[PDB]
């Protein structure tokens, strides 16, 4: 017996939608939901979505509050809709998927993922919810996450991290590393071997290996010496070159993190969404070196070193395809005289 | 068990709020309420009020659908709020009263008119609803309407017309003429002797007396001759003078109705509300004669003739006070040599 | 001493801005201005302009309430701005000019038209306002209207009609026919010989000549016979042809007026503005004949007959230029075997 | 002589409303007030309230800029309206009270608190303003704050801190500790003995006692040993338990402050208002331990220790009522074998 | 061939408008521009301007991405419009100028600065763009910036810093120090000798001289002793006095930076725009000392010392005019017994 006043009651009393009975007085003014708390209006939600304010309010209240795969993973795996949940995209302040299944009467295309409208869509199934592994077995298309083994299904160990209420973390009290499964046209698909992005921030960047500790602590020329990275253009690619008007390289998040402690810079996130590779309009405050489209990827430094060291440096230019987060990322490799000139996530 | 989805269900299925159980999917976009009817959005209500869209939607759905006193009457009688109903003001497209009693959780100041918050307010009571005559008897301040007699209380016969769903009419299938009662500070008032405005339209003006039939049918100088109105400036006051740049007189609706069949004109309702006297910015299309503030009152022609013929014509200018719709209307009487120059509802 | 509350006071009490002192409480919600009248909000103005709501409110309140030249005339004469007034465009529900001179602090580019910012702009001067004839004499660029003669300047007799509060009319109580003057770069221009559009409505179309009375009263083939219009394609041009899917001709308002009494039709005003020639997407309800762009002009039938009869009918197609409302109107003349096929205001 | 343009002049020149004469050009676009500063619009205020934009602008400009009681105190004391001032709620970006007295023509219910409409409302009086102690003596309901003694009135020493322009602080240059007085139905009410919340932030938490310094500096088991807190479940209640999926305890702000220096966490303020007890949807970033409704109170650690040590630990479960900020806060005390299991601010 | 979908394509692919061909699907909802990225809407721009959302989107995309003069400089130099570029004001989130020249069809007043509409306007010319020095030579009014010498034109060395994408910086990889030129009425104007503001932040304030290092490191009385500033009221002016309810002095940014490390305070930027002198409503959190209008200027401490030491201290009060950023800043100098009492940027 769904209602705006019941959704608001659940938000106010339970912190989110919890199936409780009750109603609070609500007022809707433009794109904001308010509730009366002893005579005055208190803001409950500001709609930042392209959906009607009361509809977005309901989807946000009904968001999955368990650790869930990051939106970039779900997108790279071709997920269209989730089964009986809402994956809230905290990067966009909006639902990650346009439609719902058994969540909200306004956005629902079906009450159950077994209805024929869902057959051509890649439905997201959560093995931690009763009956969802079975629902995935009947689904023509879908992506399944489990905490353990599913008899007969060959698993794909996903990233260590998951999003819990907008917080990307590697769980200690909760499990965040799932097994992944995919189905395309009724056939289970073998998920490729892949690297995973680390999902770290610039403000709170922490090294996750000895190489990463040595990169952040050592000087440029001695880190390169220690790790035998001569001829691999890490000075340009990872460290970044701030000597010319156009900023050179700076494509690994760890190199942006190292620069960040010395001097600050602006990263304009002109397409604010979750993705494996992020494009930024970067302006370095110290030097004034800038770049309109600077592709940045957060790979573990060891993974990036393994990728670049596994390439043939005999051709002037070529497209190098690397599977990261289940998606094929094209990198442009530019070589001269048997050494790397530049290696960057290719701008389409 | 109030909710936006239940109110919308009632609107869609019952034409208005009828206490039925059920919910329809609703979407709110800016100031409009929509409902999904087979995949597409159908508009249910556009908010023209200063209240939040969902709150105004609820008050409109919960409007009184029985013939009720016109807002101008309720306002002239000093009504602040209604007991367990919403008097919808169709002239303003808004609730006639700011707050409610037992109607809507957002606007309610009390669930019952007996709660002390209502004591200082003039509560509107409807004798056609069970218990409201007794609630009025116990209330400190209030206005009561009944279809018949009330033991002990001396009645005041109200206007013949009432508003039914925005349509002002003299009922044939329904009673529209009520008895009026008013209590201030616990004391049953003796309501004054009063004329009533006729609440007619310009497009569908109908005469309600032989004098009114003769006014609309006869030529100016012969109507005045028949009714001995020489020296009362009806040529200026009622007929209107369109010979100069500023339109002369034209203060009685019947005279606007007579002009309307011959030639059209614009009446700019710059304060769109229900009131005993209406101010219009009038532009005559035929002649181009115009007036920024032309006060217009709809009195029965016989009543207006009785008012003007009961005045002393010996002073240049004076304020004439007439009780119309229970309120004191000031008129400006302008005389010269024992004859009327003009007589108009005072602009104050 | 300008203010939102003072402008609202003037609207409420004087019908428009009248320089009176006082303030009323105002509330602004989105694009609507409201005022509190005894506890409740009453709508004073809905902004339909691209200007801020309070700024448009002020310009509308400060509109010229005397008969003024129609916007199409002012536009055809190249008027940019008005001197110390606001010409309200009732067709667009907006000010006719972007900026003001001595009207509103937000839109003013100058307090007086003598300030150098006004020198390159064609300032509209009203000879009925003291000093404006002299201001025009000293202005580099301007358009002047007078009711009578101006010493030295040779007049151009304007159209008989003017707009008074949005009502286009030929004044009887007020003068609406002005003398026109125009100065470009300091030189008093000789305005061209011109026809004038009649500015009539379809709902209340009135004939302004014996030919126009005969057109509306007589049958097609006998009006053409009486006025010797054989070979001039009036059957197609003025009467209109509703026999095919694309509606033929119907370019003179009088012919639309004649059809309107027999059967109704939709005129979609897809560019709602005042102009000499109007484009309509017309759908005939009776036959279903329609046309996406049907140019319609309101010329006096005698003027249109004089124009078409003064053309050479020897070429297949040519552009015929006619001065209407001071502007050059291109028409397309299409002939075959020495007779007109069609003649329509050119779609360019 | 109140106006939008005068309020804006005061904001621009005086930083707030200061009763000065003058006007600046203002433009209102949706919910934002702008002023023209040399050709361009500069934003003066963005409306985050449920009031009309120009009305909220005026109330914000007319906000009390002297140290005033925090909104939670005023709410706990039952304050409805303030006398001749606006208490701006910086937590909600809105006026703390719906209506005003002698502040703004749109929100005013009276010009003076002596008018009968104010009698049933708890009016806030400021003894630092001339005549307000007298006004409180005549008020049927009210809350009075003074800097010193009022003859005959028994005082209540309030919290040390007050809000000055949104900044909660313990004054050094200004007095922030007031005497409190309350009247209910014409009778002065004895304010209960109470603890006061400390109103500290997580980002800038500072200890206000030796116990608080020892809590932040010492290790868990040695702080408990020093202060003889064995059996009082401080490990769960104050320190917090991050070992399970549902976060255990963590109900004192000081314990959140201690965790904050080690590792970060998200506190979703789903009811953003000022209150004695705050509810947060907490997600710990390090462990992934989370809780939908985690009640957090900022008591001085010594005060919290005194409360928990003054309870009988012989019953399985009971409601413990503690007066904090003048309000009775219910705490749920859970005991087993003569020791505390948990003690939390009870979720209604 | 300008379009909303092409501007959005350029934003998405090039980080800004780069003249590329292509279109992306766009959706406009209220004041926000969105683009569809694999089924979902991703926000591209939120309009904070008084221009229509699609028009502001285009101007922002077409912003100058090279280091440009800070808006305060352009304003102080009387710049009205820029030639064939948009100077984005990052302080206001809006275009610095109302109209454009050859940028956007909606805001353009001309396609080239040579058109007569531009003659009376001060056009901003960028010597780094081909043909703009010539355009400045033909311009009746204008401001020119160059990186080097212009034959015959006497230069004015501008500030060391420029804004690059909102980041004020002293360029190392790019040139930020320009030569300035101005023309008024066809005549080149000699730009006065001027000091320049340093454009530093409170959060990241860095000293730019030994005196500034000594000010931040030394104690008050010993800095004054070292620099012989006895009798110059630096204790009040630069250090600030927090002992009374009204905060004393604190008019140099460096003194606010020194206080900021010890204790925090609120600076309410009630006129959020870029200007030489900034007015703040300051509330000191530690003491509670506050000031409604506290003028703050960021001069190099040596420059401020040179200004105050170059004044005659013999008069009680006088206006001291100092050229800063090309504008004449009035300072109020107050002296007693041959010593400074106070010296502040004069509030008009
Ligand atoms: C408004 C008004 N003023 C006057 C009239 N009407 C008519 C008679 C005159 N003495 C003066
Ligand atoms: C638009 C238009 N095109 C034509 C006509 N009208 C009529 C005569 C034909 N020759 C061609």
Q: What is the DSSP string of B271-295?
A: S-S--SEEEEEEEETTT--EEEEEE
Residue with tokens 């606006």: D86
Q: Name every residue whose Cβ is closer than 8 Å to that of residue D290 and which is 6 or more positions away in sequence.
A: A65, A164, A165, A174, D245, D246, D247, D281, D282, D283, D284
Whole-Å CA distances, C172 to B247, B261, B286, C71: 12, 19, 8, 21
Tell me the pairing of strands B100-101 and B108-110: parallel
Query: How far is it, in rounded angstroms, from Cα D80 to Cα D125?
Result: 11
How far, in whole angstroms, is CA E51 from its chain's centroid? 22
C91 close to C274: Cβ distance less than 8 angstroms: yes
A240 close to E14: Cβ distance less than 8 angstroms: no
Q: Reading across the β-sheet that carries E40-46, which strands appear in turn?
A: E26-29, E32-37, E40-46
Query: How far is it, in rounded angstroms, from Cα C35 to Cα C44?
Result: 7
CB contact under 8 A, A165 and D283: yes
Query: D125 - beta bridge partners?
Result: D144
Residue with tokens 């109200």: B158
Residue E61, token pair as written in the block: 């995309």
Query: How far is it, in rounded angstroms, from Cα C238 to Cα C340?
Result: 12
A219 close to A164: Cβ distance less than 8 angstroms: no
C229 close to C328: Cβ distance less than 8 angstroms: no
- Which run of H or E residues covers position C213? helix C210-217
C294 close to C282: Cβ distance less than 8 angstroms: yes
E237 close to E249: Cβ distance less than 8 angstroms: yes
B73 close to B276: Cβ distance less than 8 angstroms: no
- Which run of H or E residues covers position D319? strand D317-324
Query: How far is it, in rounded angstroms, from Cα B41 to Cα B25?
Result: 10
Which of B155, B201, B200 minimizes the C-alpha distance to B181?
B155
Alpha helix segments (H runs only) across B146-246: 210-217, 220-226, 234-237
For B96, phi and psi rounded to 5 degrees? -65, -25
- Angle subtended at Cα B320 by Cα B316 and Cα B324, rounded to the nearest 5 degrees: 155
DSSP state of A191: P
Query: E26 - beta bridge partners?
Result: E35
Q: How many other β-carbons are positioned within 10 Å of the β-carbon of residue A230?
A: 11
Max intra-chain CA distance, chain D: 76
Distance in Å, CA A252 to ligand 2 centroid? 67
Distance in Å, CA C218 to ligand 2 centroid? 28
Residue A194, min C-alpha distance to chain E (Å): 22
From B341, B346, B347, B348, the mutation candidate for ligand 1 (largest count of ligand atoms within 8 A of CB) is B341
Q: Is B30 on the interface with D (CB under 8 A)?
A: no
Same structural domain, E257 and E145 = no
How far, in whole angstroms, is CA A319 from its chain's centroid? 24
Angle separating helix axes B4-14 and A4-14, nearest 10 degrees = 170
Residue in D92, D281, D288 nearest the CB of A171: D288
Same structural domain, C348 and C247 = yes
A55 close to A45: Cβ distance less than 8 angstroms: no
Which of E283, C64, B97 minimizes the C-alpha distance to D172?
E283
For E132, the 3-state DSSP assignment is helix
Burial of A158 (0-12, 13-18, 19+ CB in 10 A): buried
Residue C342 Cβ contacting ligand 2 at under 6 Å: yes
For A90, phi and psi rounded to 5 degrees? -75, -20
Query: How far is it, in rounded angstroms, from Cα D308 to Cα E47?
Result: 53
Domain containing residue B1: 1-65
For E180, the 3-state DSSP assignment is strand
Does E291 qualify as catalytic in the annotation?
Answer: yes
E267 close to E202: Cβ distance less than 8 angstroms: yes
Residue B312, token pair as written in the block: 């002393």
Tell me the pairing of strands C277-284 and C265-268: antiparallel
Same structural domain, C254 and C159 = no
Q: How many other β-carbons are positioned within 10 Å of the β-carbon of residue B36?
A: 14
Which of D201, D246, D219, D234 minimizes the C-alpha distance to D301?
D234
Which of A274, A297, A68 minimizes the C-alpha distance to E37?
A274
CB contact under 8 A, B49 and C39: no
Query: B36 - beta bridge partners?
Result: B41
DSSP letters for D149-167: --TTPPPEE--S-EEETTE
Whole-Å CA distances, C259 to B146, C225, C284: 54, 20, 9
Taking 3-state DSSP, the helix, strand and coil percentages for chain C, each rounded to the nearest 5, stand at 20, 30, 50
Residue C110, min C-alpha distance to chain E (Å): 14
Q: How many other β-carbons are positioned within 10 Å of the β-carbon of residue D313?
A: 17
Same structural domain, C59 and C74 = no
Residue in chain D closest to C104 (alpha carbons) equals D25
For C307, phi and psi rounded to 5 degrees? -65, -55
Q: How many other β-carbons are positioned within 10 Å of the β-carbon of residue C234?
A: 24
CB contact under 8 A, D28 and C53: yes
E69 close to E33: Cβ distance less than 8 angstroms: no
Distance in Å, CA C333 to ligand 2 centroid? 9
A65, A95, A120 - which closes a domain? A65
Residue in E75, E245, E270 nearest the CB of D174: E245
D206 close to D200: Cβ distance less than 8 angstroms: yes
B163, B191, B219 - which closes a domain? B191
Query: How far is it, in rounded angstroms, from Cα B129 to Cα A129?
Result: 53
- Angle subtended at Cα C131 by Cα C125 and Cα C135, rounded to the nearest 5 degrees: 55
C 47-86 → B contacts, CB under 8 A: 65, 67
For C137, the 3-state DSSP assignment is helix
Query: How far is it, in rounded angstroms, from Cα A58 to Cα A11?
Result: 10
Total residue length of chain D: 348
Query: How far is it, in rounded angstroms, from Cα D165 to Cα E282?
Result: 9
B8 close to A29: Cβ distance less than 8 angstroms: no
Query: How far is it, in rounded angstroms, from Cα D112 to Cα D133?
Result: 14
Tell me the pairing of strands D162-164 and D167-169: antiparallel
Query: How far is it, in rounded angstroms, from Cα A335 to Cα A341?
Result: 5
Burial of D102 (0-12, 13-18, 19+ CB in 10 A): middle
Same structural domain, A234 and A335 = yes
CA atoms within 13 A on the CB side of A131: 5
Angle separating helix axes A253-262 and A210-217, nearest 10 degrees = 30
Experimental method used, please?
X-ray
Which of E151, E209, E149, E207 minimizes the C-alpha distance to E180?
E149
DSSP letters for A241-304: B-SSSBPB---BHHHHHHHHHHS-EEEE-SS-S--SEEEEEEEETTT--EEEEEEEE---HHHH
Residue D153, token pair as written in the block: 């009135």
Residue with tokens 């940019």: C80
Query: How far is it, in rounded angstroms, from Cα B18 to Cα B14?
Result: 6
DSSP state of A118: G
Residue C341 Cβ contacting ligand 2 at under 6 Å: yes
B173 close to B183: Cβ distance less than 8 angstroms: no
B52 close to B147: Cβ distance less than 8 angstroms: no
**Ligand at shortest distance from the CA of C315:** 2
* First vs last C-alpha separation in chain A: 48
* First vs last C-alpha separation in chain B: 47
- Which run of H or E residues covers position E101? strand E100-101
Residue with tokens 């969902």: B54
Does D251 qualify as catalytic in the annotation?
Answer: yes
Same structural domain, C280 and C157 = no
Same structural domain, D324 and D250 = yes
Query: How far is it, in rounded angstroms, from Cα C81 to Cα C141?
Result: 11
From C294, C319, C332, C334, the mutation candidate for ligand 2 (largest count of ligand atoms within 8 A of CB) is C334
Residue C152, token pair as written in the block: 């030295």
B180 close to B77: Cβ distance less than 8 angstroms: yes
Which of A284, A278, A298 minimizes the C-alpha distance to A247?
A284
Same structural domain, B139 and B199 = no
For B95, the 3-state DSSP assignment is strand
Whole-Å CA distances, A195 to A107, A233, A344, C212, D172: 35, 22, 16, 85, 58
Query: How far is it, in rounded angstroms, from Cα C93 to Cα C75?
Result: 16
Alpha helix segments (H runs only) across A2-147: 4-14, 53-61, 71-76, 132-138
CB contact under 8 A, B4 and A4: yes
Query: How far is it, in rounded angstroms, from Cα C20 to Cα C62?
Result: 12
Which of D88, D51, D84, D50 minimizes the C-alpha distance to D68?
D88
For B22, the 3-state DSSP assignment is coil
C161 close to C168: Cβ distance less than 8 angstroms: yes
CB contacts < 8 A, A to B, total 59
* First vs last C-alpha separation in chain E: 48
For E248, phi and psi rounded to 5 degrees? -95, 135
The count of domains in chain D is: 3
Query: A103 - beta bridge partners?
Result: none
Which of C200, C232, C199, C235 minimizes the C-alpha distance to C215?
C235
CA atoms within 13 A on the CB side of B76: 25
Residue with tokens 């979720």: D347
Burial of B214 (0-12, 13-18, 19+ CB in 10 A): middle
Residue in A242, A244, A283 nearest the CB of E165: A283
Q: Name every residue whose Cβ is closer than 8 Å to that of residue C46 and which is 6 or more positions away in sequence.
A: C31, C32
Residue B100, token pair as written in the block: 């409610």
Q: Reading across the β-sheet that carries B327-336, which strands appear in turn?
A: B317-324, B327-336, B339-345
Residue D5 φ/ψ region, left for φ over 0, alpha for ψ in the -120 to 50 degree band, beta for the rest: alpha
- Which run of H or E residues covers position E94? strand E94-95
C156, C191, C226 - which closes a domain? C191
Which of A287, C4, E191 minimizes the C-alpha distance to D57?
C4
Whole-Å CA distances, C200 to B216, C299, D101: 29, 9, 55
Residue A106, token pair as written in the block: 């306004």
CB contact under 8 A, D117 and B117: no
Q: Which residues of C touch B242 (CB under 8 A)?
A: 172-173
Residue D304, token pair as written in the block: 């919290």
Query: How far is it, in rounded angstroms, from Cα B79 to Cα B144?
Result: 10
Burial of D333 (0-12, 13-18, 19+ CB in 10 A): buried
Same structural domain, B97 and B128 = yes
Q: Name every residue whose Cβ is closer than 8 Å to that of residue E226 and which is 6 or more positions away in sequence.
A: E214, E218
Residue A172, token pair as written in the block: 């200690």
How far, in whole angstroms, is CA B230 from its chain's centroid? 32
Same structural domain, B335 and B285 = yes
Whole-Å CA distances, B149 to B128, B184, B191, B236, E47: 12, 20, 16, 44, 64
Query: How far is it, in rounded angstroms, from Cα E241 to Cα C309?
Result: 91
For C205, phi and psi rounded to 5 degrees? -65, 125
Same structural domain, C285 and C304 = yes
Distance in Å, CA B246 to ligand 1 centroid? 13
Query: How many separate helices (H) and strands (E) can be counted in chain E?
Result: 9, 21
Residue C82, token pair as written in the block: 């008005």
Query: How far is it, in rounded angstroms, from Cα C64 to Cα C162?
Result: 12
Same structural domain, E127 and E181 = yes
- Whether B183 has a binding-site annotation, put simply, is no
- Which run of H or E residues covers position B88? strand B88-89
């Amino acid at each position: 017996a769904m209602s705006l006043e019941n959704v608001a009651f659940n938000v106010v009393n339970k912190g989110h939608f919890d199936g409780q009975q009750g109603e609070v007085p609500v007022s809707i003014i433009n794109n904001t939901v308010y509730t009366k708390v002893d005579g005055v209006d208190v803001e409950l939600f500001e709609n930042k979505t392209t959906l009607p304010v009361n509809v977005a309010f309901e989807l946000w209240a009904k968001r999955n509050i368990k650790p869930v795969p990051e939106v970039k993973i779900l997108n790279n795996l071709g997920v269209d809709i989730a089964a009986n949940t809402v994956i809230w995209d905290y990067k966009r302040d909006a639902p990650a998927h346009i439609s719902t299944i058994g969540v909200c009467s306004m956005t629902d295309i079906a009450k159950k993922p077994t209805e024929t409208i869902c057959a051509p869509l890649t439905v997201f199934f959560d093995g931690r919810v009763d009956g969802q592994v079975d629902l995935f077995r009947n689904a023509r298309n879908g992506v399944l996450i489990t905490e353990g083994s599913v008899k007969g299904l060959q698993p794909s160990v996903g990233p260590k991290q998951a999003s819990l209420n907008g917080v990307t973390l590697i769980g200690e009290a909760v499990k965040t590393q799932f097994n992944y499964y995919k189905k395309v046209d009724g056939v289970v698909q073998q998920l490729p071997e892949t690297y995973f992005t680390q999902s770290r921030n610039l403000q709170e960047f922490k090294p996750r290996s000895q190489m990463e500790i040595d990169f952040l602590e050592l000087a440029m020329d001695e880190f390169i010496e220690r790790y035998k990275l001569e001829g691999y253009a890490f000075e340009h690619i990872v460290y970044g070159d701030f000597s010319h008007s156009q900023l050179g390289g700076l494509h690994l998040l760890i190199g942006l993190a190292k620069r960040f402690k010395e001097s600050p810079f602006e990263l304009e996130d002109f397409i604010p969404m979750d993705s494996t590779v992020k494009n930024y309009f970067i302006t370095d405050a110290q030097t004034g070196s800038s770049k309109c489209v600077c592709s940045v990827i957060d790979l573990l430094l060891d993974d990036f070193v393994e990728i670049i060291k596994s390439q043939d440096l005999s051709v002037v230019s070529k497209v190098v395809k690397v599977t990261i987060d289940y998606t094929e990322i094209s990198f442009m490799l530019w070589c001269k005289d048997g050494h790397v000139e530049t290696f960057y996530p290719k701008l389409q």
